[model samples]
Target: DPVSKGEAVIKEFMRFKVHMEGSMNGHEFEIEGEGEGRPYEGTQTAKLKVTKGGPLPFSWDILSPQFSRAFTKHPADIPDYYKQSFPEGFKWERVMNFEDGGAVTVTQDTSLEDGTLIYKVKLRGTNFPPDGPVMQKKTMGWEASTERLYPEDGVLKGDIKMALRLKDGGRYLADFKTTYKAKKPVQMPGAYNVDRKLDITSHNEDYTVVEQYERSEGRHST
Candidate 1:
């Protein structure tokens, strides 16, 4: 059955320590009452790391000229966040809090097509104060086409396109493409060496903000 296969694939993927890095650029546009808003260019670098079972399992960091922040996800924060019975694939969600005040909620659906894995993700930021006026409302969406899941050394490549919309009629768009390679370390007991490279473009109506991220980790052995 597809569900059983998907569960197997997801379990295999979770057994590796994974890292992902990428670059992105985007523009934002605001629709005013009178005329067309100007487009602003934005660019940024994103890095993510996932480790084995711990209080905190995931770490993601974003760097750019406009803003920079690091986000972490703890196992306790996700209540029944993983479901493996879906016929399409496995699904998971996480809510990460910012050091300041707000939080970003991320949900992902993973499915298998042929032998490849597809990832669909949505991110919503609430009470996020970084964007000033527009911080009150923001939603982001992304889709990734990944390589086949393997237990040993392998490379995963994906193109992720993201769109962001704000309550004030501001729209932001970006495209990020990256490749990640994973290899188990000969000496490390609970870690895998992973590397990534990527490129991206982004645009915004008022001001530009771009972001890219990825992560992978293992579960505790019985």
Candidate 2:
């Protein structure tokens, strides 16, 4: 059943209270003896609050330097941490673990263009060590398109991209764009809001980077 209609569209935006802003430009090529290679920018914000049955009903706060934190949990710990890092989802692409060692793989896609409703997610990593012993590689991607023009305009939108490689050749690249708006809870009375804004541009063949982020809030655990 399309995974229960993608879990009821993520529980209808987890009952709102979602605000996010973003940015993260990039370019960091270094490795040939470890020197020279710059161009970096950053900024990204986030806020999400959910309260369905309480008991730590999910709370998120992030200010990016790539992804800061303050993530409260519960709500089945996010599908039990995505069924322990994708137990069999993503339909086919799979391969997890990246925080303790390295290696990553994930893919997802859903569509319905004309009337809006599209989703795409991807991630690819390998050996990622950053600087503990060399070994690095990365790729990240995301795309979301949603339109519910009516019914209070339950909105959502997105885009993100990343690329990294190092072990000797060094490299990095990034991109992000986002927008969203939604309100309910009697039109924002006690909570039920979703607002997101984002922008980021990056390039390197020479250099170019920009970033901006602000606007993060979320509350409502009742």
Candidate 3:
């Protein structure tokens, strides 16, 4: 099946980054990161041959199947199973993370305050290979390190180094990593779903974010 012998090309890799900061009650807690996660750039060369032979009539959706598996790495208890985990009290969102001239900046204001914090943390995310699955599909879109935070005793009062592993697998992100160590106490809370906007959870309305896992604030919240 020569036709099935698909080839992968290394589309130019334009590395970009994400630099977002959140503020609560005048105190600003920030996270600077970038990768081909959403709207990813670069290529992921894999000799992807037909698994069972023949031209994979793979639908477009197939490109993003288990998309979450592509980014959300850590195996934490995703209580909602639809949103990212953020400590006990913190608001999180997956808005249209954009980039400009190789640098992306995502700013989020405290729409919904969850709790007060005074701990240190480490973070990591996947920017994806420009030619990977997601980016290949949409002009943008990539799996990334969900808002998974770990507390340690080095950077701040309670510091911890965290790594974004692969989904269903134990492979730490080997592509790119940016570690920010600082002693700062942030007071971020779970986004308040006021204004009675559309609900994201498809299962239950009375949801309780466990272990800091924030709710799905839809795609509009930044």
Please tell me which predicted candidate would have the highest lDDT against the true structure. 1
Question: Candidates ranked by lDDT, best first?
Answer: 1, 2, 3
Instruction: Kindly provide the TM-score of model 3 when superposed on the true structure, using C-alpha atoms.
Output: 0.19
lDDT of 3 by residue, 74-102 (tens): 12222121111222212222222223111
For candidate 1, lDDT tens digit of each residue in 31-146?
Answer: 10100111011112332222222111111122211111011111322211122222244444444444434444444444445433344444444554555322332433222222
The candidate scoring highest on TM-score is 1
How much lDDT does each candidate structure score?
A: 0.28, 0.25, 0.21
User: Which tens-of-lDDT digit does each residue in 1-222 have in candidate 2?
Assistant: 333333433321111112222211111111100001110111132222212221111111111122211111223212211111111221123343333354444333323333222323333445544542213112212112111112223322333343333334543433333322321111212212222233223322211122223222222233
RMSD of each: 17.6, 19.0, 21.8
Can you rank all candidates by TM-score, best first?
A: 1, 2, 3
Cα-lDDT of candidate 2: 0.25
Give the lowest summed-lDDT range of ten residues in model 2: 31-40
Name the runs in model 2 displaced over 4 angstroms. 1-92, 96-101, 120-164, 167-222
